[model samples]
Every structure is written in structure tokens, then in C-alpha cells.
Target chain A: FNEPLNIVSHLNDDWFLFGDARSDCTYLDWLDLDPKLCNSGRISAKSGNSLFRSFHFIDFYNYSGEGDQVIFYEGGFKCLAYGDNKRWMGNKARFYARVYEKMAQYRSLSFVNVSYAYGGNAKPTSICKDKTLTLNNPTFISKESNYVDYYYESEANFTLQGCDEFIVPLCVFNGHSKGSSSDPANKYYTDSQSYYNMDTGVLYGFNSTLDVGNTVQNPGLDLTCRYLALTPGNYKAVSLEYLLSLPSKAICLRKPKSFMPVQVVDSDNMTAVACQLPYCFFRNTSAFHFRQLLSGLLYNVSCIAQQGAFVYNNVSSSWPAYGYGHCPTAANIAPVCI
Target chain B: FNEPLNIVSHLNDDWFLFGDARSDCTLDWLDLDPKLCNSGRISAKSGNSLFRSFHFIDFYNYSGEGDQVIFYEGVNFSPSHGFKCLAYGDNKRWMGNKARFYARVYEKMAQYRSLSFVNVSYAYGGNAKPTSICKDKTLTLNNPTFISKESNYVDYYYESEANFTLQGCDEFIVPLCVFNGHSKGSSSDPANKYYTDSQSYYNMDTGVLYGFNSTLDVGNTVQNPGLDLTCRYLALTPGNYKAVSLEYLLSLPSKAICLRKPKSFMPVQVVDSRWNSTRQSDNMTAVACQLPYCFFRNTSADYSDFHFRQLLSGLLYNVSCIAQQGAFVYNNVSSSWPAYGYGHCPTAANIGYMAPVCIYDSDPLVPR
Candidate 1:
């Protein structure tokens, strides 16, 4: 009766340190959570040197496996990155990731659900921060269409595939938040994402924690991302994730040690660590007005810290030198590396 | 019964210049008419020299007494004496004498019998002049007492009497058709007058004419001044008018003959001669627009042509220059006479005896 599972974390240690690279301080404890399902993490206050410019989640130790989910929880601190061409930072405001798999693929099942949670108990019918609401009336249909058919309540969705030996992607991202602060446990970072879903679906707010201490679902509700192995059926391999962990203990889990594993999918078209870290860059000098602290945490955790450019040795195109992932589709989640 | 006496030769033989001494040419033919009744000595005119501004009559040397009634064939040559003073001469604009006398006077009478005809007929009434009409109704009473009840109409009547006498007086006159320079029988005049009834008593035109004809019954009419022998019965007469024939005729007829009277109602009274024979004498000259043979014949007969002012003087005052059996009243009919525009003046004495200053002394014995 082993079930398929997914894992998420915020304060992972594999993420670059803000100060000395050789300093033994790890990012693991940032993902730890409370009874109320809130998360907190300490900030790396090092000026200019701490993972300031270029890096991605999957490259924090460069590990991959199967059947496990992974997350990198950054505390409320600055996140910045620079692509090879740091001069074009103004063109990057979006963030995302690409995900794929090898070995076994499941059908009629959704592989990605990109989302975030905070302390407030939002109801089933309420709108969330990332959900877009337009103010037009239903009667504004074409002459041949009925007024009832013009509903556009939410956006479209995307999907992921079975795992293989290696998975490759061309996902991109930009800066999400600033550096220089500790994360409050009341808020959780959110992914501003675009993805595909096989079934027409709706979304809900999460508290990001549960008693079973699982990232996929709680013991009280068996609502998890269901999966069935296609090869040797029912059997799954651990690649970059863990199970038997409580959701309340997850937000402070550090990176590298916090990275989960799954069987690798095809990686022929995926980008390498150098190209993926500082994919594109942009900086906002003005203060951000997020609905909750997670917006700031997610921003700082996903984005790099450089104000200027970083040039790499290989790459046909010159992009921004520092940035974060853009969730163009949900299969394109973070921790993606070649 | 008195037979009508043969007075034809006596009336025709008047080649002599025998005239009244009191009036320069004043005579009371109406007062004298009754005395010549038995002889058929009706007042007649010597045909020649009687045209224009002269009124003359020939008494047929009537030897009758005062008790007889003279019969005269009447004629009226003073057609200009219609006695109409209009607001304007031509048309009826404002409510005039016709509307006043005809419409208002009898307004209180029975609806079927109003004062209409009596104010605008020939024998019994008159064509009131248009001048008396007004936007406001006051002009009917604004005239001299002789023309109105010192209401507008009575004063104008007396003025007509005086003016007619001043125009011509006390001479025999004939109609122009009857008088010719070549005919021997042309010297006869044939008109007489009689007093009117009550129907004409309210009419100043008829009543004053009756008075000038010496045929008016003073007792029968509305009399403000009551019974008197002359125009002195009008309210504005003077004290000495009772003593002189000049004032008498001037009051009754407004005549030039008033100059010869021995006494005056007021000495130095102003005169307005109608004759105008002497250019220097103060007189008013009338330009004739319409004429009848009576006025033309008398003016031709008199040595100094007489006019309406002479007869007007006789209706005004009483005089004693010549003895007469009864009283007389003169009629004034002249439109243009000096005293006619203003009210009548008292008669002056000895005015006619002096030679006319503008005349040549052709006869030393005779004063002009």
C-alpha cells in the first residue's frame, strides 16, 4: 500500500550561502514548520558574495532520481541572478521551470500542481493572488453564442510525463524578491505559474502543512497527485525527494540534503547548470507590495542576488546574468537542471 | 274795413333825397310798416344804387294810421346772413350747432318729437354754423349773451342783427331783377315781415330775424332780458342806449347809421363801418362770395352804400330822433364787419354829420 508522493521545502541548505562559500552554515533548517502550518528561515546577510548572482535548484548538488518531490525554501531575503548578458535585465519580469521524466510514464494523470499557501483560511470559492479575475459580464459573447458559454473563470493548465533516464527543458525565470531579511512563518512563497491540465480543473488555497507531515496531502484528506508506475508497475525509484516527513517539519528543510530524487527523464534538450542558474535578470528598486510574506519569501528564494551582469563561457545567446525560474507551465517546476 | 289805399305814385316819386336825420341812413321799416297799411305802402326799394352792402326800402307814402295791418310781399336778398359760424367753415367735425341744437336741446322731449328739425330748417329753424361744435361740449355756451342764452347761439343772433344794419340801413331797395338803370318803374321794393310762433321762438336764427323784421313777439319766446324796444334788451347794452337812435340802431343792427344819431349809449363808443366808402374810416370790407339781389340792389341805390351792419344796429337800442307809432328791431347779417368779430359797441353820436375826410367838396352845402 505504498502511495506515490511529492515533497516541497523552502529553507534548503544546498542554495548558495550569503557569506563565505566555505562556511558550514547550511540552508536545511529554513523549511521547518510550526503546528499552525507556517514556515520560517534565517537570512544570509553576507554583502555581494552569497549566491549573489547565478544558480538553480537542481544544480545545488546536481542530483536526480525518481518517485520523490523536492523544494528549495529561501528565507525572506534578496534573490538575484544574472544570465550571460546582464545588460538586458529589464526584459525579464517572468519566472518558471521545466520538468520531465524517464523510465515509466502515467496517462490521464496530472504531474504538476504549482501553488503556495499562507496562514489565512481562504474558502473554496474565494479568489487567490495568482488567480486572474476579469471584470466583464457573461453576456458579452458573439452573436451566435449563448450568454452562459462566455465564462472564463480561470486560466489554462499544462502537464508532465513519465520518468526516464534523463529529463531536459528550456524553462526560464527572473528575480522574485529582495535580500536582507528573515522569513516570517505566517506566510509561504507562491509560484506565479502557467501550466497544462488534462482535465478541466479548479484550484484552492493550501495551509502548506499537515499532521501526517507530508507535502503531497494530509492524513485527513487523501487528495494527493496519484501516480502508478508503468514499468514494473507499482514500483517507484527515489531520485531527489523524501517521504515520512511531516508538513510542519518541511519549510525549514535545507537544500542539497533537502534535494529529492526521482528516476531521470530524457535530458537531451535541457540546459546545463551554468546556463540555467542566471538565465535572465531584472531588478526592481521600488518596494514590493505582496499580499503576504510568502510573496517576498518566494521571491527571495527563487531569484539571484546580483544587481549587474555575469557572462558565461559557452552559450549562443547573451541573456540577463541573474534571475529566477518562470512557471510558464506547471511541469516546469523548480530544481530543474541538465 | 280799410280799403287798400293807392300808394303806387307815392312809392315811386321819391327822386328827392329825404332821409332820416337821426341815423345817417337808419330807419325802422318794421316799426314803420304798420303805419302804411291802408295805403298798401309796403316797404319798397328804389331799384338803382341798391347793390352791394346796401339795404333799402320804399314806403309807398302810406297815410294809414297805427291800427291798420300792412301787407307786404316778402323778399330776402341777404342770403349771406345764414348766420353759421362753424368750428371750421367746411364740414361737421366736432359736435356742432346742428348736433347741439338738434340733438341736445330736445333730448328731454318725447322720443318721437326731438329738437332735430327746429335746429336745421328754413323758416322755423336754422343751419347752425359748424364752428360751435367741440371735442368738449362747452362752446355752445361760450358766446356773447346776444348769441346764446349767453349760451353760444343767442349772442351770435344779436351780432347778426347789428352787423346787417351796419352793412346797409334805412334805404329803399329793390331786387336786382326788378331794378334796372333804364326803367322808370324800377324803384320799388316789396318785402314785409311777421312775428314767429313758439316753434321758432327757441331758434336764435328765426327769432332774431323776426325781431329785425319788427315782427317778433317778445312775449312768446324765452326772454333773458325781457321786453324792450331794441337790442338794449340784450344783457350787455349801455345806459345811454335808451336815449339815442345811433345806439338804438347799433344795438339792433350794428350800423354805420348809428354815427348820425344826436345822442349815444356811450359817447366815443368805437365804430366799425361796413360801407368803407372813405378809405380812412375804420370799417371792415366784405368780399362777397355769394349774393342775392336784395343786398346788391340796396347797395346800388344808397348814396353811400349800406350793408347788414345798419339793420343790426336797429335791434339793439331804443331811440327818439323821429316820431314813430311803434317800435322796430334791425337784423344784422354781415359776415365781415369790424364790431362783428368782437362784441358790439355802444352807438356813438355826431359821427355821420361830418364830411367824409376822403371825399371832394363837390357840394359845399351838403356834408358827405
Candidate 2:
């Protein structure tokens, strides 16, 4: 349905912006590069931080709209100084995928497909083709009757030089829908990669995953879902590949109650619109002001020494021979790390 | 018959010869004048105006021993044994043989106050009376004995004819007329009489006798008629006691002095002090499960806190004296086993003297 629909949006449009070289987008280039080189022409001479600064183009728009009804379509490229490196590229893909997935869920639109060009940033000329797949067994968006609170969706990527290396491993995708319902589905995906210095036997890798699309399924989504584990080669060789399919049962809107329509365009049958991801940076200065706020307010938190000097069994006799503490809200709780 | 007789000679001869020369005999000589001196009998030397010790020798025929016979006597200022004074005249003003006899008895009584004098001819048929002939008044003696005398007034007096018979040292009566003929005496009489230290009249209406053998009586005496063997000691020593009926001893000062033999002295067998001996009685077992000496009885008789307290002891404290040594027969040589051997009862170390702290009862039995 290409007809323009008016709609209300929960997506913060102010978060959408075109960034410059001075923006916090430069932090992505600080990965393994020397801080001294960050301000030098040497970084620019290698198409390093400068190249990443220009590839920061991200897009958020409606295909057509009027008032409370609108058709929203969003896609973006997350660039870093080392886009070819597994650490940087894998994280770039998850961040890119998560943003669009949340947008689609907020719109109450079934996930049609996704097309992303990784490795060297896709130039402004070859991106945004009509590659939408016709989702089978499409149903109407379910009424918004149930709701859950908001939660965090933070995915980290790290890269180190020489014998020092780190990577966040990917989350695997393996889940099924037991019954057909309008409730959201759980979509999960993880990526893990590691490399060792041949001469020193030093290994570095990170294992992590991104989870979205809560167990509440979009009523319009079909039971048939597809998942892909994207793996990129070493940082020295840059390559590009694009495909569109279903996501792991995860990867839905962080705010799943809202709705926006997304029209499916089949490049195989119609005149496809080709919009390239331009060389532009998108930054959020609001998210950057709080960077130093944490360290300034920090204070020493000691385990009240009186609590440390005694044991539950025999507080008086002497330090007990054996004792331990287990927090019911246990995570990484250490009683006496000091 | 008032006949003055020279009876002073009898006290001087018969009862006063054993006394020393310093002995004063003037107290019983009724005819002696207080104002007389040796010069008053000067007439004995033949001077009537200057009579000295034997100045006026006026004798009378007061004694019937003469049977109206006119007897003659020669008077002397100082007489020796067998010397009789002459009867001055047939004077019936003085007593004769009876006076001398009584005066001599009184003389001996003043010498020995600790002795008891009883008139053998006194018979009151269980009644007490006061009379000079056969005195029935109370008599105190340090240690005395009353035996059946060869009768003087009648035939031989059998001991059975006496209304009360008292024998034995440190013995007295409690006067138990209340018992009448029921139970004549108490088992604690000797000790009771000693505590009172008084003359006990056994012939009184009181139902009990305090000093003699508690069961000894003139009437029908019952012996060993109860299951309880209670006993008391004359002194504090155990060997000095004789086992008697607890009921008979209940009335005396020996209230807390009685001891009882274990009627149900069933020797409980315990291998160790901590071993709560258990045995199934009528398909039910008693367990000294609670440490210390507490016992438990699990029964189908609807258990509750009230029932638990009754069946379970030693929870708060030692309700039973089982913790005490010899509370049971500990390691005795009996049957097939010796006490204190393999089947030893609890000793000081393992005796559970305290009550059990916890007892798991069924849900329904818990007091909500």
C-alpha cells in the first residue's frame, strides 16, 4: 500500500542528525588508533578517522504520510575507524540492525526485510534499492491492550592492537513459536570472533549478543522467520554484501505498543528507488554531556568495617573458620574483594 | 490409843546406826524438846532438881505391841543398842509400834529422795487416789523397776491383773485412749515419750502409747498387715531401728523419720548412663529419649500439650528422681546380669536430669 498514511510517532526525531568531524562520532575512530594521531593528518592520510567520519550517514523517514497515519521506513550505516575489523563491523551490524528493528516494532509493522552493506561503507550511489520481500501470511496489527516497561539495549564492541585484542562474541539464534498469537516473539542473535598473534600465541576475542522483539509477537508477523549469522574477514580486506530476510525471533521495537506502516517494494517487479547512504555523520550531543558526570559524582563505597569484622555464626570468638555471603539479587556480588 | 512410847530408841538403833556421828537425828524424834540440854537429863544421875538430858522420863503405854501388858524399862541419859526405857505409866496418849515404824520410814525417805516408795498393798482398780496408807500419788525415780511382789494383803498378784504394765528402760506411755482397743500404741512411742519426758499414764483414755513397743498391748495385737514396710530408729543410726508399720508411726514426732521399702522395686536395666532404657509394655514402649532423664510415652490416647506433659517428663526439670544414683538398681548382681556391668543404670555422668527441649508432635496435636 503506497498510499500515504498519517500516524503519530514515538521515535525521537531530535535524535536524528547529520554529524561533522568534530562530533562525538570521532570516538568510534579512537578504537586502536593513538590519541596523538587522532588530531594529526596521519589519520586523514590513511582515509582512517576521516573516512569513518564521513560514513556516519543514517536515515529515518516516512515512505508517505498524513496526520495520525504514516508509513515509516528506516535504515542506516554505523561506521567506525576500522569497519573491516570483526570487532568494529560485527558491532556496527548489530547496532544498525537493532535501531531499525525497534523502529519497526514501534510502528507495529511486521518486519518485511533488511538490506545492509558492510565492510567499506557503501558509497552514496549504490545503497537503498527496492529489495523488500513479500512477507507471507501477513495479518493485521493486534490491538494494544498489554504493555511492559522499557529496558536497556546496550551492545559493546572493543578492538585492541598487537598482543592485546578483544571482541564481543555473537548471540546465537535458536527459538521457536509454539503457537500462533498476536503476542511478540523472542528474536535472539549472537556473534563471536577471535584471533591470536601467531608468534606470541596471544588470543583476543569477545562473545556477546543483541536481544530484541520481546516474547510479545506482532500479530501481523507470520510464524515463518529467518535468521543470519553475518561474519566478516580481517580488517585489511574490505568487502560488501547485502541481503534481506527475517530476523531472529528477537530484534523488535523496544517500545512495541506503537504502530507505523511500512510499504513493501519488490525490486524484481517494480521501478525500485535507489537512495545511497551519503557521507554524513549523525551525532547526539545530549548523550555526550553525561560522559564526565559519572566520575565527578563518584565516591568511595566501603563495606562498613564493622560488617566486615564479624561472621554470622560466631561474631565474638574470632573470625569464623568458614563463612560466605550470597546476595539473593546475585550477579557479581563480592563481599570482601578488598 | 494415845500411849507415849520410847520410840526414839528404835530410830536411834534400827535405822540410825549406819549414819556417822555428825548425823542429826533430832528431826524425826517427835518427843525431843527444843529447849533441852544435857543438864536437863541430870536426874538420870539421881538429881531431880538439876535434870539434864533425861530430866523428865515420862513414858506411856501408847503402843499396842504390849497388848495392854505392863512392861518395865530402865532409863539412861545415853542408851546403847537393846536398852529399853521404862514405861512411865499405862499412857495411851502416844502411838507405839505404828508410830515408830512410820517415823523410821520417814527418816529413810529424807535420806534418799531419788528413790521411789510404793505401797505394795495399794490397789485402786485402775483409779488414782491419794492416801497416807497406800499412797497412789505420782512418784519420780531416776531408774526404777516395779515387779509383782509376794502379796502381803492377799494371794500372789499376777502381772496380768495390773491395769497397766510398764517395763524396759527409757520407756513411757502416751495415753492413747482414743484408739481404745483399736490400735493400742504407736510405733514411735519410745521416741515420742523421750521428746515429752513426762510420766505417761498408759491407763488413760488416749488411744496410743508413746514409750513401750508401739504394737505391744494387752489386747489383740496385729502384726505386719500392710504392703508398706516403714521403719524408724531409736537413734539416728540405721542399725538401731526396727521395721514396723508406717501407719502406726504416723502419729508421733517421727513424722519425717520414716523410710519405706520399694514395693515395686523393678530394676530398670540401662547399659549406659545416656541410654534411655526402653521396654515394650503392653505393645507400648517408654523411652528416655530426652537427654538427661526425660522419658516419653507415645500413645494413641489422643496426645496434646497437656497429655505431652503427663507422658513426657524432664522437659523443664527433673520431674522424676531417676537422675539420682540408686534411683534404680544400678549394676546389681541379680538374674543373668550384674549391675554396673553391661546393663548398668545411669550414673552421674549420663543421667539426664533436665527435661527435653524439643518434641516433635503430630500436626493435630500441636496447640494452635
DockQ of 2: 0.00
Per-residue lDDT of B233-305 in model 1, one digit per residue for the tens? 1111111111111111111221111111111011011112222243222111121110100011112232242
- TM-scores, in order shown? 0.11, 0.12
Model 1 chain A: which ten-residue window has the lowest total lDDT? A242-251
What lDDT score goes with residue A323 in model 2?
A: 11
Using lDDT as the measure, the top candidate is 2
Q: Report the number of backbone clashes for model 1.
A: 192
The best candidate in terms of TM-score: 2
lDDT of 2 at B145: 16
The candidate 2 chain B region of ten consecutive residues with least summed lDDT is B63-72
What DockQ does predicted model 1 obtain?
0.00
Model 1 ranges off by over 4 Å: A1-338, B1-40, B46-65, B77-239, B242-368
Query: Model 2, B1-368: lDDT tens per residue?
Result: 11111111110111111111111122322112223223121011121100011112221111111000111111111111111111111111111211222222222222221111111121223232221211112211111112222334232112222233232212221111111112313344442221111111222221121222222111222332111111111211121211111122112211111111211111121111111124211110122122111112232333112332222221111111122122223221111211111112111211122333433455775573
Error of 2 at A140 (Å): 32
lDDT of each: 0.18, 0.19
User: Where does model 1 sit among the CAPRI classes?
Assistant: incorrect
